[PDB]
Amino acid sequence: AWKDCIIQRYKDGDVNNIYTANRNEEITIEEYKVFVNEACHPYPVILPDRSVLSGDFTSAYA
Amino acid sequence: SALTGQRTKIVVKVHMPCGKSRAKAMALAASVNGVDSVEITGEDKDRLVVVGRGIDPVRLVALLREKCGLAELLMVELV
Fold first, then answer.
1. What residues does A27 pair with on adjacent strands?
2. What are the residue boundaries of the HMA domain, all occurrences included (chain B)?
3. Which residue ranges make up each domain of chain B?
4. Contacts with B, A 12-41, CB within 8 Å
5. CATH code for B1-79?
6. Strand ranges across the sheet with A25-29
């Protein structure tokens, strides 16, 4: 694992998309800006298409 | 490597017959240096679409193959 965080994206009941991010990084998911804070939590939690974001440190540590 | 500096989309067919193994395979792909996003596709949910920059496709397939048994590289493409 090369970046601190994994962001999972739930759409229609399943996770079919994940995204890598470092702490305090702004990334883009589709056309949406997402901020991943120092605890690997993504914001906004609900994207405008109503998919839901969830984040955590990778199993290869912080 | 051969894709250093290039933004690539890489499609791998992986043995992932359930939701647990799909989550595991996506997390594995996501751990490979350069990977920005991973997506599950196909009507049988059997393909990973891996997007990033400077990805080593040899290492990506080798890792998927060791942990899931069967993984085959379908294509590498620019974007």
1. A34
2. 7-76
3. 1-79
4. 14-20, 27, 29
5. 3.30.70.100
6. A25-29, A32-36, A42-43
What range defines the domain where residue A55 resides?
1-62
Stated in angstroms to one decimal place, the resolution of this structure is 2.2
Cα–Cα distance, B68 to A47 (Å, whole number): 32
Best mutation target, B18, B20, B28, B38, to test chain A (most A CBs within 10 A): B38
Contacts of A16 in chain B (CB under 8 A): 39-41, 45
Q: How far is A15 from chain B (nearest CA, A)?
A: 8
Closest CA to A3 of B6, B52, B71: B52
CA–CA gap between residue A5 and residue A39 (Å, rounded): 9
User: Do B30 and A20 make contact, defined as CB atoms within 8 angstroms?
Assistant: yes
Residue with tokens 């998919």: A51
- The encoded tokens of residue B1 equal 């490597």
Answer for the pair B74, B11: CB distance below 8 angstroms, yes or no. yes
Domain count, chain A: 1
